[PDB]
């Protein structure tokens, strides 16, 4: 089966992320990163306030269906 995660950008973009529960969240981060055409070191993914690691997974973070993910941008200074 597939899980649908709600990733929203600060611009108000909602992406229909069709991913599984065992698929690494790292791939998810890169996907949106490439989608908008930005660098992975430029954006920060937060799940329920907690930052998502490259070793994290939906099944690990106990992410349920229709779970929301916030994407912040790295401060320049």
């Amino acid at each position: 089966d597939h899980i649908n995660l709600k990733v929203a950008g600060q611009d108000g973009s909602v992406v229909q992320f069709k991913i599984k529960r065992h698929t690494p969240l790292s791939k998810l981060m890169k996907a949106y990163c490439e989608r908008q055409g930005l660098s992975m070191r430029q954006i920060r993914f937060r799940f329920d306030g907690q930052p998502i690691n490259e070793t994290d997974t939906p099944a690990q973070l106990e992410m349920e269906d229709e779970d929301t993910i916030d994407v912040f941008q790295q401060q320049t200074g």
Binding site: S13, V15, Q16, K18, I19, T23, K27, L28, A31
Partner: peptide, 12 residues
């Protein structure tokens, strides 16, 4: 409403 669709590839 702005919607962007992303499909993920999962390795078996």
């Amino acid at each position: 409403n702005n919607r962007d669709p992303i499909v993920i590839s999962d390795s078996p």
